[PDB]
Amino acid sequence: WAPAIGGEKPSVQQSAKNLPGHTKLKFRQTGQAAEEELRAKDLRAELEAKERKHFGKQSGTDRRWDDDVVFKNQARGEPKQQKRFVNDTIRNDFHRRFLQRYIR
Amino acid sequence: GRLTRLYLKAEQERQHNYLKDGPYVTPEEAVAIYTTTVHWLESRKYSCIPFPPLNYKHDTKLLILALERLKEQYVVAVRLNSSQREELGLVEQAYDNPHEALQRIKRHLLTQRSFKEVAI
Amino acid sequence: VLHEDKKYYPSAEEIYGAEVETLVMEEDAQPLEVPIVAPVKVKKFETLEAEPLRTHYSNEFLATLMANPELVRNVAVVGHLHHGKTTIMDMFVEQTHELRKMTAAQQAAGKQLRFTDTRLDEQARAMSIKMMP
Amino acid sequence: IAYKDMSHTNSYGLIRGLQFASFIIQYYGLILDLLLLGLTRATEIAGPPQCPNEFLTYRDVKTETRHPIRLYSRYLNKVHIMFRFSAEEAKDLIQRYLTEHPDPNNENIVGYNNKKCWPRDARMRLMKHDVNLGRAVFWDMKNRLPRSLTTFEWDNSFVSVYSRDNPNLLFSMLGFEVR
RNA sequence: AUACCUUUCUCGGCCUUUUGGCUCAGAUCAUGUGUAGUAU
RNA sequence: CAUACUUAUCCU
Ligand SMILES: Nc1nc2c(ncn2[C@@H]2O[C@H](COP(=O)(O)OP(=O)(O)OP(=O)(O)O)[C@@H](O)[C@H]2O)c(=O)[nH]1
């Protein structure tokens, strides 16, 4: 109904997680998207380049033994399964496979 | 517990879809199947299994086999619940009077077409 | 009959259209070991020094002594394994250059110098691996 | 069927905790056995009603050899079949299979199930005639079953061919891997 | 003694709330004598 | 007077 609000000698209890560690910061160097390096370039050129590369270079274009047998061709007509995402908790494919695997 | 719930949602839905999407077995798959079975059973000179006769020579041996089987779950049993105690009571009754157990069983097979809830 | 391979929903292609690209990304392209921001590493191949060192001669003195064939001798130094070649070259370096505090660092760290054994992997086997002029 | 606050009516399956569930399973499976075999290979495997022949045996060798399906068993919902094929029979089968699942690239062998549990020489090889006889008899027996009742799944199946270039016949039956 | 306004009484009526949040409905659910004290 | 309840009291 209402959370605790968290407003702010000093106590001398020292936590283990509060001991010195990672005591200097990494900064972005030349080569890791540093700010002075990135004013120099046209990021729209590189984005439209990479998007065009992706979007084109994904498109790829510039009587027998079985005579008494009562049923014939019963696999033909079966649906081949597809890489798809269903946003359903219980009706997606991971879940149907999971329940198939673990419940016998 | 979570997986029995998840399985039972899936299984409730499978049972629903059967009643909506109808018998999956096609009317002329079922008939080819029924007919294959008929021609098999007739090739085998098979005779149906009849309803357990009244003066059936084996009726009480089969019931005693049944009851032995049902009792066997209770030969290590250390603490029983009301359905396990009720089961042991009815096993004892059917050992004590096999003839009225047999008559109840045959009345069940003859008449009973609606049954209680199964726990899963 | 439509089985319990029933479809409950349309595809992302019926949902979004032909001109929306629909991606299902269920596994990562790369492992956790490939940084997302690649560290800008000193590419530790064979690490030399950052300026021509002090010698007992100049630059132009060697420039002189090169331009006339009668004061230049070309010599390769060979021997068995370990028989002293690298160390003799090193003694030459030690007598004709300026590297004394280098020697102090060498006998403080507990190793004797190997000048021509420069590649720090040829170094850590006490072996000359590739000839050096 | 009730679990706690969950409940539904069973209309479709079989309740396996019934005491006579095994009898329904075994009779229904017998019907699926007759679907797999036909009423002639079944009546030859079974033997006459008067003189039935024992588990894996036949009355004659003319009766035994008439048909590819040589040995047959079903352990409740699990089937083991041994066929022996002529190379003419095997060839006709592999033909019909590929003409039904045409793949020019030779992507046939990729998703094949043969167990890594045995040593690498002794397992079933990657010959095209052998991988394809495997998949072709799987496919041809899987076509025998109305998919409204059951299918076979390749991932819960196992075929092993003993051919020229394969010396061992493999199966696993109950917990036993047999080579 | 009647018409007006106006004032009084009697019927008809009303919202949050008191909701201990979660999980494996959290789990299980039921196999005594004997005395005495009491309720009956 | 007969059903029930019980209590680190008492046995089986
Ligand atoms: N006793 C003695 N040992 C020496 C002398 N000179 C060098 N050494 C030792 O011999 C070892 C091998 O000599 P290196 O300097 O590696 O010479 P190398 O024969 O070229 O060896 P590689 O690099 O393997 O070809 C050195 O690490 C020294 O410890 C010397 O005059 N006397």
Side-chain angles (χ1 to χ4, degrees):
Chain A
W1 295 141
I5 299 240
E8 204 154 37
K9 347 197 199 74
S11 91
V12 314
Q13 288 204 80
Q14 162 80 81
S15 163
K17 316 201 171 178
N18 288 0
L19 290 139
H22 300 273
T23 50
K24 41 207 199 93
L25 293 162
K26 285 174 188 183
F27 294 91
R28 278 183 191 265
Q29 298 311 331
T30 318
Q32 358 211 254
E35 291 173 310
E36 76 285 341
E37 142 194 354
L38 265 153
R39 312 178 227 217
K41 70 186 56 194
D42 183 69
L43 282 184
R44 229 182 210 88
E46 355 215 286
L47 170 62
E48 317 307 285
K50 279 169 313 204
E51 292 218 320
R52 140 176 3 112
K53 155 172 105 72
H54 163 248
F55 270 118
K57 264 167 28 85
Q58 75 151 332
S59 192
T61 300
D62 212 8
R63 29 100 179 140
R64 268 144 62 204
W65 54 301
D66 52 306
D67 54 63
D68 228 325
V69 163
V70 170
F71 300 99
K72 299 304 203 293
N73 333 305
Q74 289 294 320
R76 312 166 48 264
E78 75 199 23
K80 269 65 60 140
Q81 197 58 298
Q82 306 118 288
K83 167 176 226 204
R84 57 160 65 212
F85 203 91
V86 171
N87 197 18
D88 207 310
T89 312
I90 56 165
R91 273 154 203 108
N92 55 102
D93 271 348
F94 180 98
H95 191 69
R96 293 194 40 108
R97 290 188 248 113
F98 175 88
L99 282 183
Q100 232 183 63
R101 179 196 210 299
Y102 287 108
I103 311 244
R104 305 237 304 242
Chain B
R2 296 204 192 177
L3 297 219
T4 169
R5 285 202 182 276
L6 288 173
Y7 162 83
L8 282 179
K9 305 178 131 272
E11 171 62 27
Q12 285 168 223
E13 158 153 65
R14 191 187 75 99
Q15 293 310 125
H16 278 325
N17 290 351
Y18 172 70
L19 297 168
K20 284 141 63 111
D21 321 332
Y24 294 117
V25 61
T26 251
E28 53 285 329
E29 276 166 350
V31 169
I33 275 158
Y34 180 98
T35 319
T36 303
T37 313
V38 171
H39 288 340
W40 176 248
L41 292 175
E42 173 205 277
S43 96
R44 302 268 105 205
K45 285 157 227 312
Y46 177 82
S47 293
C48 278
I49 294 159
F51 193 85
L54 199 134
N55 304 127
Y56 186 44
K57 200 256 185 170
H58 322 285
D59 242 6
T60 202
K61 282 173 245 148
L62 301 169
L63 166 75
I64 286 154
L65 280 161
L67 301 168
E68 291 167 27
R69 225 98 205 196
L70 286 175
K71 217 166 177 172
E72 222 168 32
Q73 318 142 355
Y74 298 137
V75 304
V76 78
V78 76
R79 218 158 335 271
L80 325 167
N81 47 287
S82 286
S83 262
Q84 289 175 65
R85 288 181 214 114
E86 163 171 13
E87 199 181 320
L88 265 182
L90 297 167
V91 167
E92 285 168 0
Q93 297 182 34
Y95 258 133
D96 294 352
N97 196 15
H99 174 111
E100 281 315 309
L102 277 178
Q103 300 317 285
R104 165 171 46 77
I105 284 162
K106 317 257 180 105
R107 212 210 99 228
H108 279 359
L109 301 180
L110 262 170
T111 63
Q112 250 240 276
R113 298 286 175 274
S114 214
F115 302 92
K116 307 211 142 260
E117 201 204 67
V118 177
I120 198 188
Chain C
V1 195
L2 54 144
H3 264 193
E4 249 249 329
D5 57 50
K6 191 204 203 270
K7 269 300 124 173
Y8 298 92
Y9 314 101
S11 12
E13 300 80 50
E14 317 167 37
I15 281 310
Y16 290 105
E19 69 311 331
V20 173
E21 175 193 22
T22 275
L23 314 185
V24 191
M25 294 294 155
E26 282 171 311
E27 56 107 58
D28 321 334
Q30 75 207 39
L32 195 80
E33 299 90 52
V34 189
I36 279 141
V37 177
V40 285
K41 62 160 185 22
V42 46
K43 46 199 314 151
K44 227 45 170 293
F45 287 133
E46 163 255 288
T47 328
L48 52 143
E49 94 255 26
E51 201 246 295
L53 236 156
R54 266 251 39 83
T55 46
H56 271 323
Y57 42 103
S58 88
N59 178 36
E60 51 253 79
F61 188 54
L62 94 114
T64 324
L65 291 130
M66 279 180 293
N68 312 290
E70 260 37 58
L71 288 193
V72 298
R73 296 325 192 294
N74 287 349
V75 245
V77 190
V78 293
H80 190 37
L81 185 50
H82 297 297
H83 270 211
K85 334 179 260 290
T86 301
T87 306
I88 299 176
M89 260 305 302
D90 200 287
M91 168 174 64
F92 291 137
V93 177
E94 187 158 39
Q95 68 110 336
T96 61
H97 295 35
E98 312 296 347
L99 281 143
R100 176 148 300 93
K101 275 338 221 153
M102 195 77 282
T103 68
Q106 253 40 71
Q107 258 279 18
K111 47 217 73 150
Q112 73 114 359
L113 190 66
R114 296 180 177 278
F115 211 86
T116 71
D117 279 35
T118 168
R119 314 221 339 253
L120 301 147
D121 65 345
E122 80 164 327
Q123 170 73 38
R125 265 165 305 220
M127 202 153 275
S128 323
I129 295 328
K130 59 173 222 222
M131 44 79 46
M132 173 155 230
Chain D
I1 311 303
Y3 168 52
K4 291 174 171 200
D5 35 10
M6 311 186 80
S7 215
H8 67 277
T9 295
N10 193 255
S11 329
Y12 193 22
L14 137 140
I15 296 308
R16 253 181 292 193
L18 290 190
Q19 309 269 318
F20 48 84
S22 60
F23 185 89
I24 307 159
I25 290 164
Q26 291 288 77
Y27 173 60
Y28 184 66
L30 171 67
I31 296 166
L32 311 168
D33 295 341
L34 308 178
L35 294 187
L36 290 181
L37 306 175
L39 300 193
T40 31
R41 193 42 170 185
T43 195
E44 279 161 6
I45 281 170
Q50 41 271 17
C51 330
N53 58 246
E54 276 47 55
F55 167 32
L56 286 171
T57 90
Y58 293 86
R59 281 205 79 180
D60 303 334
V61 191
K62 216 120 189 213
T63 311
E64 173 196 318
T65 54
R66 189 195 72 72
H67 188 104
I69 306 189
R70 250 50 173 179
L71 299 176
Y72 183 68
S73 100
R74 193 199 97 247
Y75 186 113
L76 268 176
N77 67 134
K78 287 156 152 32
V79 207
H80 284 267
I81 319 134
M82 213 214 56
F83 331 72
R84 114 150 306 207
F85 289 120
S86 295
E88 177 204 88
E89 276 171 344
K91 175 181 179 186
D92 179 56
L93 253 181
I94 305 207
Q95 189 145 191
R96 183 164 314 120
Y97 167 60
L98 284 162
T99 79
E100 254 290 343
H101 285 337
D103 223 24
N105 189 272
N106 281 351
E107 283 211 319
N108 224 294
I109 306 204
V110 203
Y112 200 97
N113 304 50
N114 160 45
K115 58 199 78 129
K116 277 92 166 54
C117 311
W118 284 100
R120 76 143 268 182
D121 242 335
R123 296 137 44 210
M124 173 196 188
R125 198 220 171 78
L126 304 183
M127 181 80 283
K128 281 270 312 300
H129 167 88
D130 279 3
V131 153
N132 272 16
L133 229 220
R135 292 228 165 80
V137 313
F138 179 84
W139 157 93
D140 158 69
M141 296 306 300
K142 166 166 165 122
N143 294 157
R144 255 127 132 150
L145 299 162
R147 178 183 285 273
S148 49
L149 309 198
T150 32
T151 32
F152 292 137
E153 265 205 15
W154 183 260
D155 311 62
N156 307 316
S157 307
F158 170 72
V159 191
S160 109
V161 193
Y162 165 89
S163 52
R164 264 174 178 117
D165 33 316
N166 236 317
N168 349 63
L169 190 56
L170 262 60
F171 58 105
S172 39
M173 182 161 260
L174 274 149
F176 303 95
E177 269 181 36
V178 184
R179 153 185 306 287

